[PDB]
Structure formats: C-alpha cells, structure tokens
Amino acid sequence: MFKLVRAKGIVRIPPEYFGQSVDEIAIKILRQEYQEKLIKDIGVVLGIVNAKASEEGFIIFGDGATYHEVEFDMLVYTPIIHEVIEGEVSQVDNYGVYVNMGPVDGLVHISQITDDNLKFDSNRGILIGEKSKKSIQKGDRVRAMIISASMSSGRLPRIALTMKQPYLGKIEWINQEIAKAS
Amino acid sequence: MERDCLIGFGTAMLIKDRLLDNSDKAVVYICDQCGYVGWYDRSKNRYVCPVHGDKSVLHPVTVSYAFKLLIQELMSMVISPRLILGEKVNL
Amino acid sequence: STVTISDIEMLLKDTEIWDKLLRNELSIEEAKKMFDDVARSYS
Amino acid sequence: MSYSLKTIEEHFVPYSIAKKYIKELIDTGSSSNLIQKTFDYLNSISRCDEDSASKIMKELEEIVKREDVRAVLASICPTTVEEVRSVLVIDPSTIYSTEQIQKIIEIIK
Amino acid sequence: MTIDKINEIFKENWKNKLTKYEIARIISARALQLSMGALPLIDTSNLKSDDVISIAEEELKRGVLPITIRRIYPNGQVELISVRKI
Amino acid sequence: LINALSDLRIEYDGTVRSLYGDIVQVVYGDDAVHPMYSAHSKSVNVNRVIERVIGWKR
Amino acid sequence: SEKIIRGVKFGVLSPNEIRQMSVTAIITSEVYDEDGTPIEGGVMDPKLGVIEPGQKCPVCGNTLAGCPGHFGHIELIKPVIHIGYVKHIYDFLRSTCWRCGRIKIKEQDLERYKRIYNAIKLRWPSAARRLVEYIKKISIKNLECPHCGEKQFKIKLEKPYNFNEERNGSIVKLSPSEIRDRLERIPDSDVELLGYDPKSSRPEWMILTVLPVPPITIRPSITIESGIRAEDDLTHKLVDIIRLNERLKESIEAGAPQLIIEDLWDLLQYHVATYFDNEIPGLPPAKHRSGRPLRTLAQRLKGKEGRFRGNLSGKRVDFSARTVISPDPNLSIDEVGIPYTIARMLTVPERVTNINIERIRQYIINGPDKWPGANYVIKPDGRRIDLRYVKDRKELASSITAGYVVERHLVDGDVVLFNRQPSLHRISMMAHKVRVLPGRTFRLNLLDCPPYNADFDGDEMNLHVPQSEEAIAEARELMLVHKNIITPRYGGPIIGGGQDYISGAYLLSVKTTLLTVEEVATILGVT
Amino acid sequence: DYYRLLEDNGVVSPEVEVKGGDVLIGKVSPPRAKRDTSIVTRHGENGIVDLVLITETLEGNKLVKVRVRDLRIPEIGDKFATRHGQ
Amino acid sequence: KKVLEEQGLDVDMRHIVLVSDIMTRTGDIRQIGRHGVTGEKSSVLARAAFEVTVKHLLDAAARGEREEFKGVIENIIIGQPIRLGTGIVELTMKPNMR
Ligand SMILES: [Mg+2]
Ligand SMILES: [Zn+2]
Ligand SMILES: [Zn+2]
Ligand SMILES: [Zn+2]
C-alpha cells in the first residue's frame, strides 16, 4: 500500500553550499541521501516532495558544516500483508508468474493460480489449464493477494502472491464468476 | 605534565591533535545490542558482529587504538566491557 | 533500629521530602511539619 | 552527514492521489527510471481521479474507522457486494451497511 | 542580590562581552569552514596575509559573521549573543 | 593535586562547580578576580589609580 | 552512521558469551609442526587473527589493517578459581547458607533492607555502601540459617586461593566444584542486596569453566635479526594450561588414583591463576628460558611502562623535534629560531583555496630539497604524491585546483609549541612564531628564559607542530607568548630584563650620560 | 644501490664516502633460504672509510673491522670549558 | 600559607582557599590522594589510571559498575573533546547570510 509519512531529522549543509537558500540545499541533500534507499521500519522510499528547514544550524567540533532540523514529507510504499491489489503480468516462466507491483515485481508460483492441474511453458509460452481452459500472457490485468512479505535490502521483490481465494483472478475471470454465482 | 599544561590553557582541539590524530587514531565497529567490536567483511559487503552474525547493525567509532587494545586485554581476563553509543548531533 | 540504619533512613526521608517540595507537590508549611516530625522521631 | 529520521505521521494513500503526488514529484524532481516506471504502472490500473478518490475516502470514515482499508477501497472499486468480504481482512464483522458502501461507489466513480 | 552581589556583578559584566574561549572557538570554526570552500565575507584583495586564520580574524574584528553564541546557565536559563554587527 | 582538582570549572553563574555538578565555591575566590589579572593579589590598587589620574602635579 | 562513546558497562563474562563469541576451540597443544605451518586448533591458529602484511584472514576478508583479532576458548573439565575475584567469592561464601542459598537474615528485616537499598542506591552511593557493609557484617556472624537452623560452619581463606571449612573434623578443604555449586543457589534478589548486579555479574561466573584465548593481534611474534622468532609470554603460558588440560583429562578416563588427580588439579589452577597475574604473593614466579620472570596480563597494565601510563595517559607523537638551545637577542619574544633542516622535514598541511593558490603553486615548484617548498601533494580523492619522484613539478603545479592539500615546509610566521621539561606550570609550553635561520640549534630570546627556567649550559627543548586548522587557531589565540607575560601564580610579570639589560639601563639612564646626534642615531638604529 | 660500495670480497674500500644506511660489510647467514645479515652505517651519520682490517680469531673465523671518520668543525651549539669551572 | 610564605615563595591566597575548600567538602577532612578526594571520583578509568593497579577494574566488573565519561581524563584516554575552555562554548550559524 502506498503511504505518505512526515519526518523530522538533522541535515548537514556542507560549507561549499553556503550563501544560498537553506531549503533548496536541504531538499537536494535529502534527495541525494534518501532516494531509492530502503528503511527498515518505514519501507522503500520513492522520493521527497517538500522539505522545510530552520535557518539556524549548530556547529560541532572537527566539522565546518552546519546541522539543521528539517521537516519533510515522504512517498514511501510498503506492501501490507493481507491486502487485495491489482497488477499486471511482467514475465512468465517455469519459475512462475511475475506480477509487477509498482516499483517492484510480485511473485506467484505455479501451484497457486487455480485449484486444478495446469501446464506451464507450453506452446507460444502460454499457461493452459487442462480442465479450466485458462490462458494468461503479457499485458494482463490480474488482481493479486498478498500472503507474505519481508524486507532486508538483499532483494526487494521477495513478495509471495496468492490466487486460490475465489472472487480473485483476472478481471474477466472474476466477472464471469460473479455472473454465474447468482 | 604536558597534557596538564594543555588542559590548563583550555585547548580541546589542540589536545585532540596532539594525543589522538598524530599517535594512534583508529576506527572500530560496535554492535548496538552488546557493545562488542565487530568487523567489515570486505567481500560480502556486510557488517559482522561476533555474537550477532548479521542480525544487528554496527556503527563506526573513531577511537584511540590503545583503548581498543585495552578493551581486548580486558576481555582476555573474565571482564565484559560493553561500549554504549550515542549521537554526535541531537534534535 | 540501629544508629546507622536510623541515620540512613532519616537521610532518605529528608531526600524524599526535599524532592516532593521541589516539585511543588507540597507547601512550605507541610514540608516544615514533615521535617520536624522526622527530626523528632529519629532523635 | 548525520541524520535521525524520526516519523510523526502515518497517513495512507490510495492509487489515484499517489498518481497525483508522483506526477507532482516527477515534473520538478526529474527522478530516475524507477520513479518514472512506477508512474507508468499507475497510468493504467488507476480508475478514478484525485477528487473521486478523495470523496470516496472521506465519506467512508463513518462506515469504517480504519484508514488503511479506505485506501484500498479507493483504488480497486469492487462495486460488488460479493467481493467486499474478500477485501476485508479484519476479524470483527462489519455492520450490514455494506450495501451503502457500494452505493457511494457509483455516485463518485 | 539574587544569590550575592558579586554574582550579579559577574553576570552583568559578561552580559555583552566575549570570553577568550568564545573568540578562539569562533575563529577556529570560521577558519575550518573557510578552508573547506566557503566564500569570505570581506574583500580579501588587499589583506596582508591570505591564510584562512588571518581572514577569519579580520572577519571577526569587523562584525560580518552570522554566528550566535548560546550560553546555558546552570539553572537552565539561556542567553544568546550575536557577533553579526553586535 | 592534579588528579584531585582536574574537574573544577568556572560557570557563567560565577560559581565553581565540578563536572559532575557538585558546588565547591558559591563565587570563585571572594570577588571572582583572576590572580593573573590581579594587581599583585589586589583586584584594584586605588593608590595606583590616584597616581594615574593626578600624578603629574603631585 | 558515525557515533560516539557515551558510556561503558562492566560485568563478568558469562561462559555462554565466551562460547558464543568464539570462532574455534583450542584442543591441540602443538604450536608448530616440522615444516612450520600452524596447526589448526592450536594457539597460533590463523582463524584468530593476522599479523603478516601479506596474509589475509579467513574469518574476515581483511588484511592486517582491517582485521580485528578473533577470540578462541579453552574448555576446562575441572573448574578453577579466578584469582581476581577471591575477595568477592569469600564474601559470598561467608554470608550465605550452604543449603538454600540465603543471606542468613530474617526475611522480615530483609524485605525492609531491600526496600531501603533500592530507594537510596543512586542518590547516596556512600550510604548504600555503608548499608551493604552493615548487612554483610550482621549476616556473617549468624552461625544458623533462619530458614534452616542447620548450624552453619565458619569458612577461612588461606592465601592465595585456598578455602578451608571448619566442621566437626576441624579440617576439610573445598574444591572449586562445590564452591561453584553453592554459589549457583543464591537468588537474584539476595545478590542485588549484597551490592552486585545479578543480570551482568552472576557470582558463579567467577568460577571458571571456559577460558578465552586472546587474539594473535595482541599476541605478536617479534621478528629478530638473529633468525629465531621469539614468542610473547601469553602463548608460553597458554601452552602450559592446554598441556595440563590434556595431562589431567587422560587420567580421569584411564584410572582414578584420586591423589594424582588432585595433585594435577592444584597445578592447572596454579597455571591459570599465574596466567591471569604474575607476582602473586606467596607464589613462585614463572620463567621460560633464562630464569627471567614472565610478563602476564596484569603486568601489561601496571607500571610506568604499562598500558595505562605508557600508552593511554602519555604517548609518543609525530611532528616533533628536540635540539640544544642557544640565545638570540634579535628575535621577538613571540619568535623561535629553527634550523633549515628541521623546517624542510616537518610540514604543515594546507588545503588549497582560491586565495592562496599561487603561493601554494610556488611551493610546489620548489621540490622537497629547496626551502620554502613542499614534500607531498594530496589529491581531492585522497592519493598522496611524493614530490621527489615527480618527473615534472612545473606541470603538477599548474594542474592543482581548490580542494588539493599540499604538505609544505615551515615558513616564517608559523605557529609551533615550544616546551622545556620538567613541565611544572602551563607556561612551560607556549606558542611561538617560526623564524628559519642558519644553524643547527633552537634559538630563543633572552627575555623568554625565566618562564622556561632555561639556560645556555647545554640545555635542550622540544618542538611540536600542530597539524589541523582548529589546533593552530587555538594555539595562536590562547597560547601565544606575549599574552602570558603575567603569571597566574601571583599578579606579576614572569618576563623581563636580565643581566646586561639591567646594567645597560643603569648606564644609559644615569644623569651624567650625554649623547651626540650620531650616537643617538646609532642607538636608535637597532629599534 | 645499498651494495654499490662493496668490493668483490664483500667489504668496502678505504677513502670512500658513506651515508647513513650504506652497507660496509656484506654477510649472508645459514637458514634458521639464506638470510641477509649485513652491517650498515647508522642512521644520519656520514663519513669516510678510514681503515679496513682482516684477520682471524682463535677458532679460525674471519674477523673484519671497519673504521669510519667524520670531520667536526666548531659551530653554534658546541660546548667549551676552562680549567676554572666556566 | 605560612609554610609557603616562610620560604619566600609568593602564591596567591585564592589557590590555597580553593584547596582548603576541596579537602573539606564532605564535612570531614579528606586527603587529596587515594583514600580521599581522588578515590571518591566517579570514574573507573580515571581511578585505574591514577592508581595503575588493575584491582579497580576487577571490582567494577564484579559489581557491574557503569562509567559515564564526565571527567576530562577519561575523555582524553578514549579520545574525545573535553568540556573545559573552548569545550564549554557552543555555536550556531545562519549560512544564508552572505
Ligand atoms: Mg642548563
Ligand atoms: Zn552484537
Ligand atoms: Zn580477521
Ligand atoms: Zn538455609
């Protein structure tokens, strides 16, 4: 789920950037130091939209730079467990189906698309179900389910997807399911 | 006695320059949970703490090398000196 | 109790009274009364 | 370069106004491809406008008192009563005003 | 007489006066950040010496430095002194 | 002596305190006058001031 | 993120911690085989650390620069007493019951004692110490546990580490196993009331079951030109402990005379106690080859050449010089005369800005052998350049910009610290301005001698060159000579006239002295 | 370049200027490969080779002695005394 | 004062008064050495440096003491700036004012 958090911190203004507006330098330093950088308790950062810094900065021993208190708004995104999110198929192989989830790509394995027997990597690279008559390929719009996810900065797209739950799947699959349910 | 002279004059940065920068300045990595000295692996690009693996975060601290030698010599005896860390700048 | 234990306890009580007075949880008169009570009880 | 990075707010953002914010970020920040790629991901799945997502998210405060579920109801628009329970992952049972939730969907979206 | 008259005289004397430690700290900080690429706030075209410490001394003598000393008294009271044109 | 006295400091109050907060003297010395700035242990030599002012005609 | 040290927490090292931090286990007592490679599992296992410039550590992919030492552990089958904690084990033994492990005080008074101690432990540490001493004094002399009433027996300590009960037989000696088993029974509350931290210093941890093995980084091998490596005494002891550990283990599983077992248990314990500390009172010192007593862990820390007073309170420093001194009446009181040789060896690192670029370029054009010149150039990314190995110094001068660092010679007007020992007051070391002169001596003005108590009978003084901008600024602002004319001991000048000055002043100022225009011009020409 | 002064028998020749670090006698020792155990001029002590002596000890081992001389001219900083304690 | 003065040595009285104050602070007369003012200091490392013995560190480990780096000697030992002289001053700047 996409989030927007507000944060307060200390930003260091190098002496070579003196004589100009503190806000511009502060937002520049924040972008150079927080863009595309994973945070353990907040998630992966997608950028800084606005920042406000105080004009007073304190000086410490051994440094020529000034340190200012800054308040800024972030655009962090973190996929929350047990949430229904739409997505698109990015690549399909014997590994499974890779669904794109914004900056990262989700992962689902062949054992959990439909409660049946299916053959993957068939002719024309299409996953076809023997008793379901289902075809999935590029450009699809799937509505996936989150079951488990963890972040360690070793590999961002380590997200596991789920499709066994009814009322979930392709937009056409769910539409026919609803129509035939009643 | 020269250190006492420098203290009497009130020169903190001169004391630092004489007694740390020009003799045995060093950098060590401390686990934030146990306060023991870790290391940088330089091959897997990760911080490793001896009781801790990669389950904790290590921070670099500039210190006199003789103080680290003293810490290791104290751990040679059955003594557990744990270093407590702090921030240079606070809110 | 023992003289040393009585001294330690009266020091502790004086410390508590001063702490409570300095936090504006007591008035000057109440602090005076408690100080007198402790001094008389531990004399 | 010493930082603290303490957080104060924990607001939630649906897909539609996330498009608004990244657009307000890409135009002046001129970020990398990863930020630009995320915008492409939102160029198709997004179904409503910023005002539509705001209206649906603000009118559901009384029906449900959780901000996280309101941000996913403002991005998917289930518009059916048979799949809302699939979206719900909250143990307490919601009152039988779910039919009102769907009604709010089409008047806005 | 808050505590004693001598203490009041002391605090009144040091109200608008810089101690030698504050002058040394200001000059050292200014020189350190001036050697790191900062732009001098004075002309620096006809000065006798062109090293950073001399320029910092001249910048302190004629108040152009936007630096503020924060004095914290033991009871918690805070006094602010500005060296920018006093 | 150095190890006994090394932690004493002059405060902005005018008080002599230890770095642990203990008060040693309410005001340094008795008049808060540094011996280095003294007129040989005297804060002011009044006879010297008189000589400074009217010494050319005395 | 860069942090700072704001505290140190002390405690006793738990055996679980000793095992957990260890990278290996020392079992073999053989240090080196025929060829010379170190045996895996010995004292010189490469897993412990690297001391060779070209070797790489197995535990961490780091060389001698980036590798901190790693710890091993020696497993002990029979527990031993740590000699540094005997006075604490003795107090734990004398003030606790040996059946239930209690302070031997009625719990009604014990609860209020604990309440008071918890209330006062932080505000009045001395009162807490007195309270703990009182509790120990009244609990030692009980002779019957209130929870048991089992006729507690008094315990006596025989130096160095011999504990002796006094039962009905009047003689029985306690083994470390029973001592540790008794100390395991004490609860955390009773330990806390006695003045010890239970979660960080548990009393039975003072009885050793596992022994840490120091890293080789603190245990280096001295390279002597004689061709034979000399090992430090720590390895020379650790081999003895591991030998006795192997020597005693085989006896347990093969036979049980029970008299040779205790005659080896009293030798391993001696070895461990002497490894921790030599010069134990009432105990023979240990030699290695020539009857010279060994230097052990506690000997590396005490003395005037030990760790503390030799490396922590004071140390040898860089950018310093020492030379005989000679007079110079032509210097200012702020100046010191420096030889050309010393000016060209000691350097000051100056960062290049847009105001000083031409002067630094002229320094670079001159090499390391012409004054004023430079010895090194540091590029902005951080690579040094030896200017004596540069093919063309004129092109390197043209290529420097703001951000470069040039280590240039001393020039006239530089600030240095000038010192004479012993340093009795603070003006025994003052800041001076450099002046480079021909000669091989430190030149000093004659009016500057009283503060240094200096003389020209063959005396020598020290020089120190501050290296950073902040240090130089502090030295120039606070330590300059003329700012310290009046001494802090009393309100009087410590700098003034000497011997020829006084008689010259008398002869000039006497009322019979008459001068002509030429003589006046000659006198005033020196001013 | 530290062995440029040795002759074919491993020892320097008289009337040769030497600097600190120059090798005067070349020597290799049995392993305890062969190790270099040469003797060099001490640090910062120039001079001229004055005498080279080759003989044998009682056992029969070769013994080599080299004398180096340095000229000293009085300069500022040298000590002098009279027969009266001055 | 009498001992110093009868030898012809000039020392200002403020130093002597400060010494007298430091030796009577606790309500009793204490020596400046090990069993007095110096031994009452709340730093383990400073005490172990003045008294080069190691028994102080063993006592601290046994009792689980905590060392907090408030004095000047311990900070010099570990290598951090002291709070005397220029260490009492704290600065603030406005970089924008050019
Ligand atoms: Mg002499
Ligand atoms: Zn750890
Ligand atoms: Zn290693
Ligand atoms: Zn009992």
Numbering used by the authors:
A (entry chain E): 1 to 182
B (entry chain B): 1030 to 1120
C (entry chain Q): 36 to 78
D (entry chain F): 1 to 109
E (entry chain K): 1 to 86
F (entry chain A): 823 to 880
G (entry chain A): 2 to 528
H (entry chain B): 785 to 816, 829 to 882
What does the publication say?
RNA polymerases (RNAPs) are the engines of transcription and an important target for the regulation of gene expression relevant for health and disease. We have applied single particle cryo-electron microscopy (cryo-EM) to characterise the structural bases of RNAP inhibition in archaea. Here, we present the high-resolution structures of the inhibitors RIP and TFS4 in complex with the 13-subunit RNAP from Sulfolobus acidocaldarius. Our results reveal intricate interaction networks between inhibitors and RNAP that rationalise their modes of action.
Like RIP, TFS4 binds tightly to RNAP and efficiently represses transcription. In order to investigate the structural basis for TFS4 inhibition and compare it to RIP’s, we solved the cryo-EM structure of the RNAP–TFS4 complex at 2.6 Å resolution. As proven by the cryo-EM map, the TFS4 ZRN interacts with RNAP between the upper jaw and the lobe. The N-terminal segment of the TFS4 linker forms two β-addition motifs (β3 and β4) by providing one antiparallel and one parallel strand to two β-sheets in the upper jaw of RNAP. The TFS4 ZRC binds in the NTPs-entry funnel of RNAP in a manner that is related to its eukaryotic homologues, but without reaching through the pore into the active site. Rather, TFS4 allosterically inhibits the RNA polymerase by inducing conformational changes driven by the displacement of the upper jaw, encompassing Rpo1″, Rpo5, 6, and 13, and the Rpo1′ clamp head. The superposition between the apo-bound and the TFS4-bound RNAP reveals a swinging movement of the jaw in unison with the clamp head by 6.3° concomitant with the splaying of the DNA-binding channel by 5 Å. The TFS4-induced opening stretches and bends the bridge helix by 3.8 Å and 2.2° leading to the loss of density between residues D808 to T813, likely due to the unwinding of the helix in the TFS4-bound RNAP. The ensemble of bridge helix and trigger loop plays a key role in the substrate nucleotide binding in the active site and its translocation cycle, i.e., the molecular mechanism underlying transcription elongation. The TFS4 ZRC in the NTPs-entry pore clashes with the tip of the trigger loop resulting in its displacement, which is confirmed by the replacement of the RNAP trigger loop map with the TFS4 ZRC density and loss of structural information between residues R86 to E95 of Rpo1″ in the RNAP–TFS4 cryo-EM map. In summary, the changes induced by TFS4 binding include the (i) widening of the DNA-binding channel, (ii) melting of the bridge helix, and (iii) displacement of the trigger loop. The TFS4 binding in the RNAP funnel is ensured by electrostatic interactions between the positively charged TFS4 ZRC domain and negatively charged patches on the rim helices, and the upper jaw of the RNAP as shown in the interface analysis of TFS4-RNAP complex.
